[PDB]
Symmetry: C2
């Protein structure tokens, strides 16, 4: 089939199985895709979202090693725009939306949902380490 350009953005701090399953899902939305992943800058993540432990450079170097990732934009825009989609020939934005800042994307037919996997996160694994030390 024809090659579909998919865009997915995120913070990707301390990459874990949860991000990877999401990336894999974005990549397989169609039989032939190019998955572009956008990695948010440090400043704007902290300003708008929350604490980041890894720098942009580290967050991006880890993503380079994931099988599903075809291209990375680093840093990426914090807000996706129609001009951005035209410039990089993006057919679909892959998100999990979790008023609606993505309504124009749905109206344009350019939105494809992916999902999160709970309980697989890096912070969760440290919780598991700590359970081995009894409170008493």
């Amino acid at each position: 089939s024809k090659n579909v350009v998919i865009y997915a953005d995120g913070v990707y701090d301390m990459l874990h199985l949860g991000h990877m399953k999401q990336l894999e899902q974005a990549k397989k939305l169609f039989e032939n895709t190019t998955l572009i992943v956008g990695v948010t800058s440090d400043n704007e993540t902290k300003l708008f979202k929350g604490q980041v432990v890894q720098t942009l450079e580290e967050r991006t170097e880890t993503l380079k090693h994931i099988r599903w990732v075809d291209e990375i934009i680093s840093p990426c825009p914090w807000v996706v725009t129609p001009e951005f989609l035209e410039k990089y020939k993006i057919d679909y934005v892959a998100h999990d939306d979790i008023e609606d800042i993505y309504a124009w994307l749905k109206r344009a037919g350019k939105f494809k949902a992916t999902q999160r996997t709970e309980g697989v996160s890096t912070t969760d694994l440290i919780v598991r380490i700590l359970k081995n030390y009894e409170d008493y």
Copy 2:
């Protein structure tokens, strides 16, 4: 060129950039390779090596997502043997050796060194998180 079968084994607990750079190095030892990765069982890792936080199933599911990994043997033998190399048509074992349990591999011309990257580990990132809380 001809296709070279490379074998690398390890625990791969809480996969981080350090493992990935090593896998990438094993994969690029030659122009055309098949990288087989062996993941050690829970029992034998704990018995011979140390604590593991993720099960075999989790440690293996994460490796499935890495670009360099062509095949996984899970669980893998704890000790590599010549019969193992013959069975899976392995040309080289990729290790970082860090008396010598791998001397027969070097004698057979079947040993290729890779290296570790320090300071990139998942436990290190939690140390970074904690630096934000001042002791006083």
